[PDB]
């Protein structure tokens, strides 16, 4: 049985930046789906807007280098 954790994880938005300015914010949240499956076996990723919102207090091209996340990954 998968560990139904109430876990908190720290992400590093290193790889996403340094490439195309015009794409970051989308790749940002798309990157979010990457580790979440990898570190939690996620079948489908449901993100509240706010925890997604803070990545873009910026619109297009400015993004915080890291952020904290909490997951109630139900079945």
């Amino acid at each position: 049985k998968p560990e139904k954790e109430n876990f908190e994880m720290v992400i590093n938005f290193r790889r996403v930046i340094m490439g195309r300015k015009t794409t970051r914010t989308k790749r940002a949240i798309k990157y979010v789906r990457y580790m979440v499956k990898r570190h939690f076996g996620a079948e489908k990723v449901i993100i509240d807007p706010l925890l997604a919102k803070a990545i873009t207090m910026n619109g297009r091209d400015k993004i915080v280098r890291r952020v904290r996340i909490a997951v109630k990954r139900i079945g």
């Binding site: 449901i46 925890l51 909490a70």
Partner: peptide, 21 residues
């Protein structure tokens, strides 16, 4: 809530409905 390292960290969550798989 607090982690096992015991640091107090905030949790923001604002949605009541979400499509089950």
């Amino acid at each position: 809530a607090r982690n096992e390292k015991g640091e107090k960290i905030i949790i923001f969550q604002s949605l009541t409905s979400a499509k089950l798989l």
